[PDB]
Paper text:
RIFIN, a large family of Plasmodium variant surface antigens, plays a crucial role in malaria pathogenesis by mediating immune suppression through activation of inhibitory receptors such as LAIR1, and antibodies with LAIR1 inserts have been identified that bind infected erythrocytes through RIFIN. Notably, human monoclonal antibodies that contain LAIR1-domain insertions in either switch region or between V and DJ regions have been isolated from donors, who have had malaria. To define the structural basis underpinning interactions between wild-type and antibody-inserted LAIR1 and polymorphic RIFIN, we investigated the overall architecture of three types of LAIR1-inserted antibodies, determined crystal structures of LAIR1 in complex with the RIFIN-interactive regions from two RIFINs (PF3D7_1040300 and PF3D7_0401300), and used the resultant structural information to derive a LAIR1-binding signature and to identify RIFINS from diverse Plasmodium species capable of recognizing LAIR1.
LAIR1-containing antibodies have distinct insertion modes, including type-1 insertion between V and DJ junctions in CDR H3 region, type-2 insertion in the S region between VH and CH1 region, and type-3 insertion in the S region with deletion of VH and CH1 gene. To gain insight into these three insertion architectures, we determined structures for all three types. Despite differences in architecture and flexibility, RIFIN binding capacity of LAIR1-insertion appeared similar as assessed by co-IP and electron microscopy (EM) analyses of a chimeric MGJ5/MGD21 antibody in complex with RIFIN.
Author numbering:
A (entry chain H): 1 to 348
B (entry chain L): 1 to 216
The structure:
Amino acid sequence: EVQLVESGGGLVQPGGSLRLSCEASGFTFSSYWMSWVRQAPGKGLEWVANINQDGSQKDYVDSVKGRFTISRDTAKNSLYLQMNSLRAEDTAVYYCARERLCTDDSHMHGEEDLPRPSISAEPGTVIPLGSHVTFVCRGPVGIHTFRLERESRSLYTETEDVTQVSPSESEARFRIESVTEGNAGLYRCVYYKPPKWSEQSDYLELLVKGEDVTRALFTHCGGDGKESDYHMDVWGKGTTVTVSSASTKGPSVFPLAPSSKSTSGGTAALGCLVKDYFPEPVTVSWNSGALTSGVHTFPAVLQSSGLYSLSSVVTVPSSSLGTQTYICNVNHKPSNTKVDKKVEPKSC
Amino acid sequence: QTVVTQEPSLTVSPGGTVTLTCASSTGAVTSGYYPSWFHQKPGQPVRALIYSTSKTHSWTPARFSGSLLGGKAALTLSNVQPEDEADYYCLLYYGGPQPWVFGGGTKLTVLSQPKAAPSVTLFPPSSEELQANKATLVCLISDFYPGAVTVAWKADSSPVKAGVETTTPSKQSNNKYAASSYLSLTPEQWKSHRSYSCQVTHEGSTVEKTVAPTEC
């Protein structure tokens, strides 16, 4: 039931403050780093804040520095983001995420038989372009099939050509005669000694010459391969933080007059522009709803002003353009504003 | 200031194979940055898929798997099924303060309808709105598939970016998408130039409409 629930989001005028809360469940909160990641509407993910297990150390993206602080309470079993001096761009949905650290350590898994296999590269893990490299895969004596996998399963090489090398061990060799940049990447050995398969090898990194590799040893994640697996295991569903200098406001309606850019075939596009209102919804009908076919009202826009705008368009024949009347019925119930306006061919 | 770049939109046939890149502005993406990959679907939380460039989870099928490719981390889909239509984000670990930089994202669309080029309709400012000391050009985009469009606005033939405001694509009843773009001008800028144009680019297919001040 590992879970994170965010709350405390809401609607604030710029310069105000909020505190987001994120209650953890189904795991030991005390033990992992925790981060806040925001997503502004219609855009991607931005990391906001990072906090330690005990609250010792923490940092913030530069945008929110000095305005946002991050904290946690293991007794209350939850994560807090205090958001002071809110700006407009701070509007987003805020998510709570469980960071993972060097869980890629010397021993993170444990398995009894069958004994997991070992992988080797000769002459090394760094190879010149166009040269030879061989993967040596070692496992128990009496292996039936030995497979060298690449990053994706289905990219792999199985073999029955296994050699017993020691009284206890047999190996298989997979050679690459001339290295391609498509050869570089992650490899891992597995074996089928019947009845069922093996645990998988460790990962191995192959690189073309141009780099320097000191692959890894007992010091797990130590330096160049800093503590990572930062795979943000668990994500909440966030809360909406809305920052707006905007009040209730009826819209102003303008006629989008059928222009010479009438769509070809005796069908023009009448339109009705619903400009600068707040908040949604706005409902649009034509001729008291007597016209349905051809009508397309659009998604509204959120303008830098903080006000919404909208457009309602109906395709309609031109012999019709001559004769009868075409009227917008625009209804903004948040301001109890109702506007009727006849769209017309322009005099010109 | 560090920037991580991935393709804005990509399209696949049911059963196909796609690869999504993730480019560090530092110039190169090694395994020491330990890339990670996530998808986000409507209504449900960001799920996590790949870590340390290739490491998989319980919920991720072997259809999904990533690698490093051409200085950029990559995610390779296989036997792409319609359930996979989502947005996909990558993650890089620059150790130190501010250690996390996300990628822009990739809206992956799985084709269930044939590609529809967009219908663009462009309106001049109204005679009423101009008298109110304001000017708004209205560019309306409907009935396209996939829901990935790029909009740019043109003064006479030069480009203009200020006062542009564009919606995000939104599915219609027909399961095709629709979007709007509003260029905001002063009446002076409007009457100033020969014409103003709206370019709707949709799958390498650019459609440019025009309206003129010298109208009526």
